[PDB]
Amino acid sequence: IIEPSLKALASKYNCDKSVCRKCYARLPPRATNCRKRKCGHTNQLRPKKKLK
């Protein structure tokens, strides 16, 4: 156990992201398009897979 607030603060940077389906890039959670050129700024995004 870390602490509940400290787990929230660490998960803000480590777990509450989104993943581009084409190029696996770690993206902002409210993003609409990937920031990478190689996937062509696609809008195929998924949430980052949580535990539990």
Partner 1 sequence: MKYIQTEQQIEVPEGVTVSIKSRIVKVVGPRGTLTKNLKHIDVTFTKVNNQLIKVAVHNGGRKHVAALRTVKSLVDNMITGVTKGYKYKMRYVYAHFPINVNIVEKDGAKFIEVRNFLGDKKIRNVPVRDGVTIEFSTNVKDEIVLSGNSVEDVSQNAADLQQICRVRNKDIRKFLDGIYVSHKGFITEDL
Helices (H) and strands (E) in the chain, counts: 1, 3
Q: At a CB cut-off of 8 Å and minimum separation 6, what does 39 contact?
A: 20, 22, 23, 25
Nearer Cβ to partner 1, position 7 or 38?
7
Return the amino acid letter for 23: C
> Of residues 4, 13, 30, 37, which one binds partner 1 by CB under 8 A?
13
Residue 14 binds to partner 1 (criterion: CB under 8 A) = yes
Residue 39 binds to Zn ion (criterion: CB under 5 A) = yes
In this chain, which stretch among 13-21, 29-37, 38-46 interacts with partner 1, using CB under 8 A? Answer: 13-21
